[PDB]
Amino acid sequence: ARVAVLISGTGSNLQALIDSTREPNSSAQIDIVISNKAAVAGLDKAERAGIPTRVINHKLYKNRVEFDSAIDLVLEEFSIDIVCLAGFMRILSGPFVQKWNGKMLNIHPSLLPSFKGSNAHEQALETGVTVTGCTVHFVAEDVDAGQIILQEAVPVKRGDTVATLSERVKLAEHKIFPAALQLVASGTVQLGENGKICWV
Numbered sequence: 001a002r003v004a005v006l007i008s009g010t011g012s013n014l015q016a017l018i019d020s021t022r023e024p025n026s027s028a029q030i031d032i033v034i035s036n037k038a039a040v041a042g043l044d045k046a047e048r049a050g051i052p053t054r055v056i057n058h059k060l061y062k063n064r065v066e067f068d069s070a071i072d073l074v075l076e077e078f079s080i081d082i083v084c085l086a087g088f089m090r091i092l093s094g095p096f097v098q099k100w101n102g103k104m105l106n107i108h109p110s111l112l113p114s115f116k117g118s119n120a121h122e123q124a125l126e127t128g129v130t131v132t133g134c135t136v137h138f139v140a141e142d143v144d145a146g147q148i149i150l151q152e153a154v155p156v157k158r159g160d161t162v163a164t165l166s167e168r169v170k171l172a173e174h175k176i177f178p179a180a181l182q183l184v185a186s187g188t189v190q191l192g193e194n195g196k197i198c199w200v
Contacts, residue, residue: 013107083103
């Protein structure tokens with residue numbers, strides 16, 4: 001499968017995804033890394049790995065469908081089969097999500113359904129859980145609510161800050177995100193017609 005990775009920041013998940021697609025027997029390859037923001041470290045990581053990049057400034061569009069269409073155009077340009085959201089911070093419009101249904105995955109730093117939203121760690125610390133984690137899920141219209149592919153629990157240590165908890169969780173993300181990409185790229189895991197996840 002030909003894969004596109006959308007990012008909005010440091011792209012901490014890129015290295016693990018990139019290495020994985022280059023290990024023996026990978027069913028995927030990363031052909032383009034797209035950012036909605038210029039000058040973020042994720043772009044350099046892509047370049048250094050020898051992967052083409054594109055910056056599509058969401059602030060230059062009228063609305064989300066417009067912005068999403070500009071992304072869809074590049075995805076078509078690179079005949080992309082699967083899209084991975086890695087620290088991508090723009091909520092996508094229904095038409096784009098429907099078009100990529102079953103082919104777009106996101107990594108989220110909590111054990112969904114708990115702590116949906118971009119400040120998952122802050123919520124975890126505020127709620128007082130001793131166990132949190134990360135989740136890779138197919139992207140649905142509803143934010144952080146698509147079908148779950150894999151999850152990994154991570155302990156929260158007393159005195160953790162957002163920074164320390166975040167770092168520990170990223171280590172789990174680096175394990176399940178690449179694994180989930182392989183499962184979908186190999187056709188091993190699919191979003192069934194009944195909208196439920198199915199393992200072949």
